[PDB]
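Usage example:
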Amino acid sequence: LVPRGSHMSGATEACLPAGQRKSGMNINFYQYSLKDSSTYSNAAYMAYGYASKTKLGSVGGQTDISIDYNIPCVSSSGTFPCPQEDSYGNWGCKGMGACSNSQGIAYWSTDLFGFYTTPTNVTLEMTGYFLPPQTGSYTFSFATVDDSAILSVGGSIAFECCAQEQPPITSTNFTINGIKPWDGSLPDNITGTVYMYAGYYYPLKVVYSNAVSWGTLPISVELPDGTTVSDNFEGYVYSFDDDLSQSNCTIPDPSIH
Ligand SMILES: OC[C@H]1O[C@H](OC[C@H]2O[C@H](O)[C@@H](O)[C@@H](O[C@H]3O[C@H](CO)[C@@H](O)[C@H](O)[C@@H]3O[C@H]3O[C@H](CO)[C@@H](O)[C@H](O)[C@@H]3O)[C@@H]2O)[C@@H](O)[C@@H](O)[C@@H]1O
Ligand SMILES: [Ca+2]
Ligand SMILES: [Ca+2]
Ligand SMILES: [Cl-]
Ligand code: NA
Ligand code: NA
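Running the assembly step on the lines above writes:
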């Protein structure tokens, strides 16, 4: 008469928040030191230790969540962002000539979500809930990572149901571990799969850090129907203000709810 449930309580925890839904993710920004090539290599830091550093500010309602930050080239014709693959020599930017500025200093810009900060050296935390329209397997991916990132899905993994705005939880059970290894870079097209049931809200956390110059995090998901959603997650990601009083908010096992 009923489904048997995923084996060994293996279903990912989801949520049914009852409050006012808002489109998009919240992005919190935290201090990260220029040219610090070690802090971001610790799992504890990328899961929650980032929030022990100074919080710089925040922006809400973000649906286009990929990162593609290019440093300036101060050129003969003005100052323009340089795609990393167009940088050359010591140094110039293709179509611009030689650049007079250093690749090794901090730069200030609104390129990350409109928030004025130093995209060269920062950590950010994206939170919200992913709403699957289809029941099945979802494959999240980072096409590349510069410098360090994680993605976590699920209640008690990304954050607690109905508690999006709380200090980070301590889970290191990342869905995608894109942490910069101690020994030098990771492979591209890093991925993690989650089985999701339609209509339930799945906590989603992305933590991303840049230590110097370029920053890159192209985020995608492959849906059960085999199509891919890249960069702009409008229609899939939502936020809810905390409601720690909502007793029934956590769905430990969506296949038997
Ligand atoms: O062929 C390129 C380069 O090769 C040799 O130089 C190698 C490296 O020398 C140093 O360690 C640094 O200059 C590296 O440059 C990276 O790091 C500095 C910070 O120390 C950045 O200012 C610079 O933009 C560059 O950053 C890249 O790597 C970072 C760490 O992985 C990323 O965070 C960043 O986004 C970017 O990808 C040099 O690469 C020499 O032969 C030299 O002549 C050549 O130009
Ligand atoms: Ca819990
Ligand atoms: Ca970088
Ligand atoms: Cl050129
Ligand atoms: Na880029
Ligand atoms: Na610029």
